[PDB]
Amino acid sequence: KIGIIGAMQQEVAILKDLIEDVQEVNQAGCTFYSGQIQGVDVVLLQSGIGKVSAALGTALLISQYAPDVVINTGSAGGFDASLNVGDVVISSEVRHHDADVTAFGYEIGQMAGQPAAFKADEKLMTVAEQALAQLPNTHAVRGLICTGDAFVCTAERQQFIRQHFPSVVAVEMEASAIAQTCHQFKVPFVVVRAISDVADKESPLSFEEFLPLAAKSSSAMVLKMVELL
Amino acid sequence: MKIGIIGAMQQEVAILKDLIEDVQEVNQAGCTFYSGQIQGVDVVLLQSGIGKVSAALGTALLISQYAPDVVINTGSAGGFDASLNVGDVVISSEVRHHDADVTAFGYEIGQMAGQPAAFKADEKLMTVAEQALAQLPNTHAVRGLICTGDAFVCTAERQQFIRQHFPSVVAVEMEASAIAQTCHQFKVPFVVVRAISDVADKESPLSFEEFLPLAAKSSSAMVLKMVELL
Ligand SMILES: CCCCSC[C@H]1CN(Cc2c[nH]c3c(N)ncnc23)C[C@@H]1O
Ligand SMILES: CCCCSC[C@H]1CN(Cc2c[nH]c3c(N)ncnc23)C[C@@H]1O
């Protein structure tokens, strides 16, 4: 069973209308779509936006459907210099960019009672790298993904994040909530999203224009990965 | 009739835990659920763990699996209102994310996309708290806005940021908005009833360390009465 999570309707629509014998179960503002994608047991969660919605949705997902693995799909704000819109970002690890409990010796981005970072599953990162070889013309970057309850689009916020997380390749608003929840459940996860913007003055309109591409690019990556297990 | 009670830390849940009769304990997802009774009232006490993600996850589990009728958030807090000293009680009229920012998309500061700007506490629960306070002379209380973020607040800069965007903040902590938002999504009534352990400045780490026991005692007495009245 493959657990698949996206925040927005737009991020989950391409996978939703590809599963067969769909059983739509919407509860607590989440929608769960369960069935089969070419013979593989899936469950697509539409979580809604942000860290709290994602955690709540992921908690309901794992406790009631017990997937074997979790894949986080959708858009992202690019930080890596090589990323253009449509490009894929794969998580090596996930951090809260907006967690700060340093007053008690925790390193920046580390939440009390948690690891500094949540590490993507080694198999799943391997499986995403194989899926990438199936899409010859898509460029991809593997690295740190940072999440916060903010849409990043100002010089000053971008600068804050680059400072504390030099290695960030990309930014979004649900991944660390998904990862932390998976960590606490001991479920393997990977994040595989695509770039809609580069987190600056222009990202609102770039996101506007390029979310469809981002969801196409991301959903193609996930469609592959599904088969590869 | 069933009361959900949520604290983040062991220290914050210990007092109420020792009062549950015929306790049954579950250890799921790094959460722990204490179900049973306190003076005849069916309750379920959750120790969520710290921060917004833990709080949300725990609350989702709590509601989906135990269907409580109301939720009460208990524990410590950082005081922002000037009339507040350590051990004083804070009761939410509403809860907001002080660290949410989607203003790029037409939302007001602290409002998450797809969410209300603020999560309003249940009127009946506010009332019950007010009556519970009427029992505890010599505890000063303040009803008002509670702000949540994934940060312990202890610099003048954070404090300024927060007062500038949420002028009416009475208090600050790290779980309430996560609980309030998941309650909203589940359509379950909530109230935050916490007590002050610090004043969110340079001194708050040691202050917190020193007065977390007091705030737990202060907050726990409030919730005990409320259980009684419910
Ligand atoms: C009016 C609708 C509100 C849109 S809020 C942004 C969406 C898109 N998701 C990823 C995402 C792309 N670009 C980003 C950026 N610059 N910062 C942070 N996250 C992102 C996260 C969140 O689910
Ligand atoms: C020792 C482990 C790490 C402790 S992190 C602080 C705890 C206490 N809770 C309430 C809390 C009191 N004072 C506060 C302040 N100044 N800022 C924000 N939250 C608070 C929130 C969080 O669960």
Asked if B66 is an interface residue toward chain A (Cβ–Cβ < 8 A), one would say no
Report how far ligand 1's centroid is from the alpha carbon of A97 (Å). Answer: 14
Nearest CA in chain B to A179: B53
User: Which residues fall within 8 angstroms of residue A24, CB to CB, at 6 or more apart?
Assistant: A31, A32, A33
> Any chain A CB within 8 A of the CB of B56?
yes
Could you tell me which of A177, A169, A179, A174 has the C-alpha nearest to residue A142?
A169
Residues from chain B that touch A64, judged by Cβ atoms under 8 A, are: 64
SS3 string, B116-169, reads CCCEECCHHHHHHHHHHHCCCCCCCEEEEEEEECCECCCCHHHHHHHHHHCCCE
Rounded CA gap, B89 and A127, in Å?
A: 52
* CB-based contact B73:B125 (threshold 8 Å): no
Q: What is the CATH number of the domain that holds A173?
A: 3.40.50.1580
3-state secondary structure at position B18: coil
- Residue A79 near residue A170, CB atoms below 8 Å: yes
Q: Which of B 69-108 lie inside 8 A of A, CB atoms?
A: 97, 99-102, 104-105
Ligand 1 centroid to residue A134 C-alpha, Å: 27
3-state secondary structure of B196: strand
Task: Tally the domains of chain B.
Answer: 1
Using a 10 angstrom Cβ sphere, with 0-12 exposed, 13-18 middle and 19 or more buried, the burial of residue B167 is exposed
Q: What is the DSSP string of A82-142?
A: T--TT-EEEEEEEEETT-B-GGGTPPTTPPTTS-SSEEPPHHHHHHHHHHHTTSTT--EEE
| Closest CA–CA distance from residue A121 to any residue of chain B (Å) | 18
How many angstroms separate the CA atoms of A221 and B44, rounded? Answer: 43
CA-based torsion, B85, B90, B94, B99: positive or negative = positive
A151 contacts on B by Cβ (under 8 Å): 101-102, 104-105
What whole-number distance in Å separates Cα of residue A47 and Cα of residue A9?
A: 9
CA B186 to chain centre: 17
Note the Cα A141 to chain centre separation in Å.
Answer: 14
Q: Mark yes or no for CB contact B50/A113 under 8 Å.
A: yes
Q: Which chain B residues contact residue A111 at CB under 8 A?
A: 50-51, 53-54, 150
Phi/psi at B110 (5° precision):
80, -10
CA geometry: angle at A95 spanning A93 and A96, to 5°? 160
What is the token pair recorded at B164? 């500038």
Selecting from B31, B182, B204 the residue whose C-beta is nearest the C-beta of A56 gives B182
Range of the domain at A84: 1-229
In whole angstroms, what separates CA B116 from the centre of its chain? 18
Q: Does A204 lie at the interface with B, CB-CB under 8 angstroms?
A: yes
Residue nearest to atom 1 of ligand 2 (CA): A104
Interacting residues of A173 by C-beta distance below 8 A, sequence separation 6+:
A7, A49, A50, A51, A54, A147, A148, A149, A150, A151
Query: Of all protein residues, whose CA lies closest to atom 23 belonging to ligand 2?
Result: B50
Experimental method: X-ray
Say whether B29 sits in a helix, a strand or coil.
coil
Q: Which of B101, B198, B203, B228 is catalytic?
A: B198
CB contact under 8 A, B151 and A98: yes
Residue at B35: amino acid letter: S
Helix, coil or strand: residue A25: strand
Exposure class string for B192-219: b at 16+ Cβ within 10 A, else e: bbbbbbbbbeeebbebbeebbbbbbebb
Separation between Cα atoms, residue B162 and residue A35, nearest integer Å: 45
Resolution in Å equals 2.3
Residue B198 identity (one-letter amino acid) = D
Question: Could you identify the residue written with the tokens 């020792």?
Answer: B18
In angstroms, what separates the C-alpha of B61 from chain A's closest C-alpha? 7
Q: Tell me the C-alpha distance between A137 and A153, whole Å.
A: 28
Element of type H or E holding B10: helix B10-17
What is the nearest CA distance from B20 to chain A, expressed in angstroms? Answer: 26
Q: Among B11, B95, B155, B174, name the best residue to mutate to test ligand 2's pocket (greatest count of ligand atoms within 8 A of Cβ).
A: B174
Cβ distance B186 to A28 less than 8 Å, yes or no, reads yes
